[PDB]
Design a protein around this ligand. Structure first.
Ligand SMILES: CC(=O)N[C@@H]1[C@@H](O)[C@H](O[C@@H]2O[C@H](CO)[C@@H](O[C@@H]3O[C@H](CO)[C@@H](O[C@@H]4O[C@H](CO)[C@@H](O)[C@H](O)[C@H]4NC(C)=O)[C@H](O)[C@H]3NC(C)=O)[C@H](O)[C@H]2NC(C)=O)[C@@H](CO)O[C@H]1O
Ligand SMILES: *[C@@H]1O[C@H](CO)[C@@H](O[C@H]2O[C@H](CO)[C@@H](O[C@@H]3O[C@H](CO)[C@@H](O)[C@H](O)[C@@H]3O)[C@H](O)[C@H]2NC(C)=O)[C@H](O)[C@H]1NC(C)=O
Length: 361
């Protein structure tokens, strides 16, 4: 099985223990580590952070400890305007320039492949996404003629049915991608004012509409659209989504006034790292949706939907039972990487729990 793990560039700036650099990563934990995110300047792939070349070097040195480890560089991300992707892919000329710049860049910095994170392709982009993937892969096949191992090509894809129907030709891109990571953790819409879990595994007998917003549905749908199980990887979150309650009601349906207050280290309203959640739990009230198989917690007027060792192991077994290629984790820097916040004298408790299940067969 594959265990795809993302590492984010901006995590280096978090204060104190929250600060995470590539060398904190256990070389034997994941099978693939993806660095997020690369930028595109003058239609060419390029660095993002001022010290990226140094961090690229630090990450790729892990391969001197674990020779089987593969690394990829992801282009795009949520702070990358999708309009920019749309513009590059729409014109055969700009598209070709970008494609041509990738192999040399990856080779120079020691990466084994490219991960595409266009979030998200609209109805008018579907056509061009296919061309982009097809042509990128053709370039990689051609570059391998030089005697070096062929570069890998992957893509992170929405798990939302409407988003999938709208911007992706799944059957077509599946044949050219080495693997596809399903973003099965952004299910509760940032649009409404209700409490809800962002990464439920199952539908849950307690609600008719949005039977589409759960991991099981997204996986089944992808398989029906033509994506081979051996290329599908299920996304598992290492963070939680928080809300500020509008009333004393804490159960399903409870009204929301807005996102939860920022975590001390992550400082982003709406989300908390797993290590911050481990601290939050002290004095909190824990619950678990039996139908969806995921937990949530509450303290004061703060409501948090998250994943723990149990739910993560649960998703990993589901994935194996469906014979998928493996799991993808977002993200290493949000798990208890130091292993000092979540009790168990264990580094990367969430990611390790996933690895354990995958190692069972
Ligand atoms: C849950 C989750 O992971 N969601 C992701 C989004 O959070 C993510 O958006 C990213 O948001 C983070 C934090 O909110 C943001 O981090 C900032 O990164 C910049 C660098 O790009 C830092 O700026 C540096 O400051 C120091 C001094 O303080 C300078 O020395 C340095 O030169 C600066 N860098 C630059 C630009 O020159 C900020 O300090 C840091 N701020 C925070 C909040 O700590 C990221 O930039 C956002 N990511 C990107 C790629 O823009 C979103 C990104 O796509 O993806 C989700 O996964
Ligand atoms: C990711 O790539 C972006 C696309 O190139 C880049 O956007 C910006 O690109 C240039 C460079 O800063 C900005 O302005 C130009 O810069 C030169 C100065 O060297 C000027 O002479 C020229 O007139 C022009 O102003 C753009 O304003 C900006 N592009 C936009 C917003 O359309 C991003 O900077 C890059 N991201 C990071 C963090 O590296």
């Amino acid at each position: 099985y594959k265990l795809i793990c993302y590492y984010t560039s901006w995590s280096q700036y978090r204060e104190g223990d929250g600060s995470c650099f590539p060398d904190a990563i256990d070389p034997f934990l994941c099978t693939h580590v993806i660095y997020s995110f690369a930028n595109i300047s003058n239609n060419e792939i390029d660095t993002w952070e001022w010290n990226d070349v140094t961090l690229y070097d630090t990450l790729n040195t892990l391969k001197n400890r674990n020779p089987k480890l593969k690394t990829l560089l992801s282009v795009g991300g949520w702070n990358f305007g999708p309009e920019r992707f749309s513009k590059i892919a729409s014109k055969t000329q700009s598209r070709r320039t970008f494609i041509k710049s990738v192999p040399p860049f990856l080779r120079t910095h020691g990466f084994d492949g490219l991960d595409l994170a266009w979030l998200y392709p609209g109805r008018r982009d579907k056509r061009h996404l296919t061309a982009l993937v097809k042509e990128m892969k053709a370039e990689f096949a051609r570059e391998a003629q030089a005697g070096t191992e062929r570069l890998l090509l992957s893509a992170a894809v929405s798990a939302g049915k409407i988003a999938i129907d709208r911007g992706y030709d799944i059957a077509q891109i599946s044949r050219h991608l080495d693997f596809i990571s399903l973003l099965t953790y952004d299910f509760h819409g940032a649009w409404r004012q209700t409490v809800g879990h962002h990464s439920p595994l199952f539908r849950g007998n307690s609600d008719a509409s949005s039977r589409f917003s759960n991991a099981d549905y997204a996986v089944s749908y992808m398989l029906r659209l033509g994506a081979p199980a051996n290329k599908l990887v299920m996304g598992i979150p290492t963070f939680g989504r928080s809300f500020t309650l509008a009333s004393s009601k804490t159960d399903v349906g409870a009204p929301i006034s807005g996102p939860g207050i920022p975590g001390r280290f992550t400082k982003e309203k709406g989300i908390l790292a797993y290590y911050e959640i481990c601290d939050f739990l002290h004095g909190a009230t824990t619950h678990r949706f039996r139908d969806q198989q995921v937990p949530y917690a509450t303290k004061g007027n703060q409501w948090v939907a998250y994943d723990d060792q149990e739910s993560v192991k649960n998703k990993a077994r589901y994935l194996k039972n469906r014979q998928l290629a493996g799991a993808m984790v977002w993200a290493l820097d949000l798990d208890d990487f130091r292993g000092t916040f979540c009790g168990q004298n264990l580094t990367f408790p969430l990611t390790s729990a996933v690895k354990d299940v995958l190692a069972r067969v």
